[PDB]
Design a protein around this ligand. Structure first.
Ligand SMILES: O=C(O)c1cc(Cn2ccc3ccc(-c4cc5cccc(Cl)c5s4)cc32)n[nH]1
Ligand SMILES: O=C(O)c1cc(Cn2ccc3ccc(-c4cc5cccc(Cl)c5s4)cc32)n[nH]1
Ligand SMILES: O=C(O)c1cc(Cn2ccc3ccc(-c4cc5cccc(Cl)c5s4)cc32)n[nH]1
Ligand SMILES: O=C(O)c1cc(Cn2ccc3ccc(-c4cc5cccc(Cl)c5s4)cc32)n[nH]1
Ligand SMILES: *Cc1c(COP(=O)(O)O)cnc(C)c1O
Ligand SMILES: *Cc1c(COP(=O)(O)O)cnc(C)c1O
Ligand SMILES: *Cc1c(COP(=O)(O)O)cnc(C)c1O
Ligand SMILES: *Cc1c(COP(=O)(O)O)cnc(C)c1O
Ligand code: NA
Ligand code: NA
Ligand code: NA
Ligand code: NA
Ligand code: NA
Ligand code: NA
Ligand code: NA
Ligand code: NA
Ligand code: NA
Ligand code: NA
Ligand code: NA
Ligand code: NA
Lengths: 380, 380, 380, 380
């Protein structure tokens, strides 16, 4: 019924055999056959399929309103499997500010295999239409993007992909299935770095993929079985377990996001704030039409590098570390941590200023997170 | 010093911090930074590096007399990472009877990316020399191969690769580092399905890669970080743990292999037997010169399909299942389980007869395994 | 600061060595010593202390505002360790409706060792004063109790224990440290079945104990080390992880409890409802004075056994299983599942009627849980 | 059939449901019931029974030729459960040099509950007969003992216990079920610290108990369920896994023990050597009649404390740490590490000299262990 109930009872996460109310961890590589070719329950070799992995795959398929789920050893392994749907000579359109690991995989690995890529500003969907080439086979978008939270119209992107015969893919990591369901808007494939919100506890590296398309599912299953970037059973178990609290965690994060943004907008040491909930944000209306909540990632400008470092030092409840979607609130400086290889003038031109700070809001008390960040900003 | 000591004390498998005598399991995705860019112990994000994974990587590097180790989510993920060292238009030479997953990955995935492959009979190394093209960049060999245990001269293959500027790769799964060390014979990269003997307990799917070449190591690290087929920490821990007993397990397996082969050769219901320890086996001398023991995989002919099925039913201690390298002895019929998609006449021409049985010798009592297989053969 | 922040940042749950943001799992039994008697970080043998167990012990000590925490292999192991503080000939006062496992341990195990027990109605604290004997050494109370949710005044019980030289113990399982903190009210020892709300995911059996008393802590540490009912490292890790979401889970449970009770009170197929939030409940005022929220356990009367069974069959979101504090809502019938060995007339006299149903409210959507239970009651 | 086969195929360690060739890890606390009281596979609450724990219990019952197995959170938890078979006023006879944890539990915990104990020299079994009191209910023996490896006649002890109506218990930790089977010699209960050889990898703390007596089994099951010192599922899994290699590990250890003892006896810096394989050892004949191999624990005298410390520093392959039965060879000095609270003159009188060294032989290469210990002794 409602989303919080679906998180508990969606998918198959009990043991039919013993009745165990949690998915058993099948730390196993192979399975007895009673006769050659007769599999007791469809399992024969864990790379091909493992029952704990099947459980997390059923969860992500259910939560995204798809039919087929796939669990990979990381988000970028999920992305690589999806890119491997294509052949040498095929072309992919992606948003211009796609995640750095995705950018790196495409431009330093897959271009060596003849995959062609163009990174365009998908905030206007006619930019996609202009970029379509005779060889284009795939449209891959994140929304909202990192670290400036640019929003792309999913429904229109799906319509463009359908009209031009493209496989459409949405990286739905930042929004999670709790708030945004691209398959419902006509997208072919949705994927996640489950390392972030889905696992939710900073203790699993994993990717998840869902689709309703039987033929794309067969192709993905073949790629997974052949290149072997599969998620192990312990990590699959911890994912199922973490997803149980996704709704509660995202709702707490959203209450905190709203209050933190109010504070940041009022504070004299903060300039521009980047988040899709802000009414003047580009494509705010599009976001509200395709999602019923918000990501916990916020970026905002302070004056310079020294102010950013001092802000980090002065907080009590914001933890300096990579990743996002923890139960802890995390803080980082993209110019120093993710975009340091880009020349400084190009960083500034892209809006990645020396003082741009990114926070990933966690599940601490809202008043504490607001007050802590405010008092730290007061020291600037 | 000696091999059994190196298995216990080689690599770094204790905790410098607490002194724990086993590697802690770092079920974690990210790491506190005390200042931006200052990593306490070199860790920042588990896809890039995880301390439990670093432990198993140090073990495989030590055991293969290499400098750098890499742990992947499966054997075929290790193989795919190694193939991704190449570009569209590059060519690979492999032995003609390479593992089916390797064959499938190369001919159904990587050929779509412009990688070219030729499968040649490497039991005569001049066949490699003839197959070298202007575009050849890699030589990839297993020895002994599956299921007929063909032997390829590693030292000569390394010399050919060096002379022609090829990256040389040995899939050393069947022999393990306990008996065969390709890096010592001049090979650039050695890899394993750790799913088999190294883990040894049929409870981890994993791949391991080692090299002494700093530049190839940098390229592999970049591929691993970018396509993300990494082994998780629980599976890394179970690998380290299983490798502890590798020497004892392989030695027991070898005692049993010798006695079982004597029995099979004497038995009137068995025709040809395939194993490198047999003195009339092709390249027996080459194998003994490059290895100081034997694989536990043996293939042998009984009369027909019905005899193979009856043999399987009549044994008490041979378990019908996929994979090899378990503590249990495993039994299978390649024509029905691995080569069933090949036409029957081509199977027969290749020696994969309907009655060809493959056993993976486990660590049960030698007398029991011999007597059990003999009494089952007596029912034919 | 506030409770939700303390749940994330209270205790020591990161790795000082690598900076890992989660507690490493020390699957280890012993620790290197650099010189005889010099422990690198205070660890020497995991029964005595294990770093992952130390982490969960620091969490429960912090959350209960104590100084010392102890992790046991189950709730009843924690209870047994606490009872072992006493000697043959000593006497314990407990509430009359204490948990069945506690009742069984005391009356079938510890009475064989000369421990004497009396079970009295502690809802009037002068009943405790009357029951005190010259040999009484301990007062052990749960509040609220199972399955009728009787409330005992903790502060007055602590005052009585102090005046009469008794060790006071509160089993705080049903309320959790998020809502009720007995050590702050003067109680000597607080304990939990962490199997329930603290772990929160029905996947760990564990007990936790906290105290501020250095001498009682030394005695408990000695008992734990000598009788060895210690929690293992994987279960300790899963406890730390589950406790992260305790605040969010308990708050969702409480919203649902309030609405479900309104529904039950209005429904013509339901008679008496048992929960401390109901204003006519005995010691409602005491509960509100010693707790700032509610347990998710509710009991209520339907007509008879057949109605209870039909209610269970008609629900979609209530799961028939033992235990409480899951993310799933659980349902049970005490007369058939926990009190079936008590004669029927004595059950009825105690209020455990054939139609008494117990629910443990989970974290599903509030509207779904209310509507589901209501429509199931409509079928009666 | 033979012991090495029984280690692989004895007990139930596969999944009947999926066919998984290893025991699934049931990280779960409770189980769905299809109707009230109908358990799908006999499971209802993990403290009472858990399927992974049931697997390790079936293994230890099979290996000891018993009917019922029990898995506890530590060796001393197993011992405490067995002692709890008795009542206040009952008396236990034990060997005089019983393990320090056992001594401590009995004399500092269970004597407070009215259990009476006498520690007698059981190397002459008529000492047991003299010590029997009207209140004696239990005879508890280790053989061989620590650290001087005293041997007690198991068969005669069982006969004495039967004649006098005593429960007989053997702590079989040092010998393991691979070499010594007390239940076959008439003993009622056998127990192990599975922390040592059975797990074998220094990564699980656990106890195991086996019996053939249905009534004692019912009593132990009740004690386990009521005091809750149960082994968790991950540790149960790691035990099953470690036991697979018990035979290979013990046989390697025994080859090394024989050669090391030869070296120690020949070395001028070593005085007395303590091990049951030495023909002049008291009850050598008894040991050979009740066991078909040897423990890996050896004690031997060097001159003084400084020589012992120097010996430890000079070895490369002997690790200073607590516990025994690792894959690593371990070394310790009882006078400083286990018996330091005993006065020095009483230590000397008992044979625990300042120079007494204890080694636990691991599975490193035999020649390396002999040569390393010899060269270290040469520095004295
Ligand atoms: O602001 C963006 O443009 C952006 C941010 C991210 C997220 N992100 C997380 C870690 C990280 C590391 C490196 C980078 C990049 C360098 C670079 C250069 C050209 C084009 C692109 Cl897309 C990129 S990305 C981005 C990273 N993705 N795009
Ligand atoms: O006897 C061989 O030729 C051989 C055996 C294996 C091992 N193996 C394990 C599982 C499995 C599954 C399928 C197959 C194959 C079908 C096929 C067709 C043409 C060329 C090749 Cl190489 C192959 S392999 C082989 C498999 N690899 N090669
Ligand atoms: O309503 C109560 O009196 C009550 C309920 C519980 C909780 N509970 C959970 C599982 C369970 C199993 C058995 C029983 C009991 C039988 C019995 C007989 C005399 C005195 C007492 Cl205390 C008890 S308890 C209680 C159980 N504890 N007390
Ligand atoms: O040589 C023995 O007498 C002996 C050694 C062990 C094994 N052991 C392992 C760790 C450890 C720690 C303390 C002690 C003890 C102090 C003591 C005092 C009186 C009687 C006894 Cl029995 C004991 S034992 C023994 C320990 N058990 N007995
Ligand atoms: C409500 C519910 C669904 C249906 O979800 P929709 O968002 O309406 O498509 C599926 N599964 C479970 C377990 C549910 O409770
Ligand atoms: C002996 C030993 C080595 C050296 O191994 P080689 O096979 O001689 O290269 C390395 N590490 C450890 C721990 C050893 O014991
Ligand atoms: C606020 C806070 C505390 C203090 O908790 P009190 O309930 O005020 O005693 C302790 N630890 C952490 C991490 C906190 O955030
Ligand atoms: C041989 C065997 C047994 C019988 O063991 P005994 O020592 O003869 O009592 C039991 N189980 C298995 C699996 C065996 O192989
Ligand atoms: Na479900
Ligand atoms: Na669609
Ligand atoms: Na501002
Ligand atoms: Na080492
Ligand atoms: Na080289
Ligand atoms: Na033959
Ligand atoms: Na903390
Ligand atoms: Na106090
Ligand atoms: Na009512
Ligand atoms: Na078995
Ligand atoms: Na008997
Ligand atoms: Na000597």
């Amino acid at each position: 019924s409602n989303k919080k109930t679906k998180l508990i009872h969606g998918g198959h996460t009990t043991d039919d055999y013993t009745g165990a109310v949690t998915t058993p961890i099948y730390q196993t590589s192979t399975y007895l056959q009673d006769d050659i070719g007769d599999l007791r329950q469809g399992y024969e070799y864990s790379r091909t399929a493992n029952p704990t992995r099947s459980s997390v795959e059923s969860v992500i398929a259910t939560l995204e309103n798809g039919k087929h789920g796939f669990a990979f050893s990381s988000g970028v392994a999920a992305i690589s499997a999806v890119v491997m749907l294509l052949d040498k000579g095929d072309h992919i359109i992606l948003n211009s500010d796609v995640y750095g690991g995705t950018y790196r995989a495409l431009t330093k690995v897959f271009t060596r295999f003849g995959i062609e890529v163009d990174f365009v500003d998908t905030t206007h969907t006619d930019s996609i239409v202009q970029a379509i080439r005779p060889t284009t086979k795939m449209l891959f978008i994140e929304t909202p993007s990192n670290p400036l939270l640019r929003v792309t119209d999913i429904k229109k992107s799906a319509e463009i992909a359908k009209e031009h015969g493209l496989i459409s893919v949405v990286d739905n990591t930042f929004m999670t299935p709790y708030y945004q369901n691209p398959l419902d808007l006509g997208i072919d494939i949705v994927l996640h770095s489950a390392t972030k919100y889905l696992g939710g506890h900073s203790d699993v590296v994993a990717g998840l993929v869902a689709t309703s398309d039987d033929k794309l599912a067969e192709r993905l299953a073949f790629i997974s079985n052949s290149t072997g970037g599969i998620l192990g059973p312990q990590d699959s178990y911890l994912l199922v377990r973490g997803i149980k609290t996704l709704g509660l965690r995202m709702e707490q994060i959203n209450r905190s996001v709203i209050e933190i943004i109010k504070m940041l907008q009022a504070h004299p040491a903060v300039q521009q704030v980047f988040h899709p909930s802000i009414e003047s944000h580009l494509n705010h209306d599009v976001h509200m039409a395709q999602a019923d909540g918000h990501t916990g990632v916020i970026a905002f400008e302070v004056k310079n590098t020294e102010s950013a470092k001092q802000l980090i030092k002065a907080t009590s409840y914001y933890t300096l570390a990579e990743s996002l979607g923890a139960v802890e609130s995390l803080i980082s400086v993209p110019a120093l941590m993710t975009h340091a290889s880009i020349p400084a003038d190009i960083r500034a031109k892209e809006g990645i200023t020396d003082g741009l700070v990114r926070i990933s809001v966690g599940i601490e008390d809202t008043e504490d997170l607001v007050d802590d960040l405010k008092q730290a900003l007061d020291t600037l």
